[PDB]
Amino acid sequence: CSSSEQSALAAAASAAQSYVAESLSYLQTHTAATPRYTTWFGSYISSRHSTVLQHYTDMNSNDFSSYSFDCTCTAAGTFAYVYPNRFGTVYLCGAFWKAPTTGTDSQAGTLVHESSHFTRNGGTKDYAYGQAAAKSLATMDPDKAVMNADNHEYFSENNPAQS
């Protein structure tokens, strides 16, 4: 990673840390159905809420700015990826650099997505990609929604806002 890329990652890491902190606080204080929760995680029920609450509790504990970043990947369509059992290392690809720091499909949101994938943080899977698929997963299969990385990213980004 170049100096500029490291600078960009410092901004993205900070924003991702804030996304996770706010999302965790939101989950801790809302123990009933709300538009933001149901849209990304489906019908509210204690067990599922507990699952997502735990994911954000784990991600909140890790220092995003201390992750080991790798910028060798040049694949244009890919934002980033990680190996679940190789905690703390995040590989950035082409799309990551085109994405805005915050917002929809952002750098910060991408880090939240990847962070949730680490086994240490809960090991979310990729059952659905994109907002359309994520929302459909939440409505049709909540069990997998609370285990889908993109559903966490979109809940955190919260753009447009709902809460």
Which residues of the shown chain bind ligand MAN in the complex (CB under 6 A)? 35, 38-39, 43
For position 129 contacting Zn ion by CB under 5 A, the verdict is no
Q: Minimum distance from CB of 136 to ligand MAN (Å)? A: 12
- Token code pair at residue 161: 């806002």
Question: 126 vs 143, which CB is nearer to Zn ion?
Answer: 126
153 is annotated as an active-site residue: no
CA distance 9 to 18: 14
Question: 38 vs 62, which CB is nearer to ligand MAN?
Answer: 38
Binding partner of residue 31 among ligand MAN, Zn ion, none, CB cut-off 5 to 8 Å per kind? none
Question: 58 vs 153, which CB is nearer to ligand MAN?
Answer: 153
Q: Minimum distance from CB of 142 to ligand MAN (Å)? A: 10
Residue set of the binding site for Zn(2+): 113, 117, 126
Contact criterion met (CB below 8 Å) for 138 and 127 = no
For position 83 contacting Zn ion by CB under 5 A, the verdict is no
Q: Name the active-site residue from 22, 114, 153, 157.
A: 114
Contact criterion met (CB below 8 Å) for 117 and 124 = yes
- 152 burial via Cβ count (<10 Å: 0-12, 13-18, 19+): buried
Q: Which residues bind Zn ion (CB under 5 A)?
A: 126, 149
Q: Where in the sequence numbering do the catalytic residues fall?
A: 114
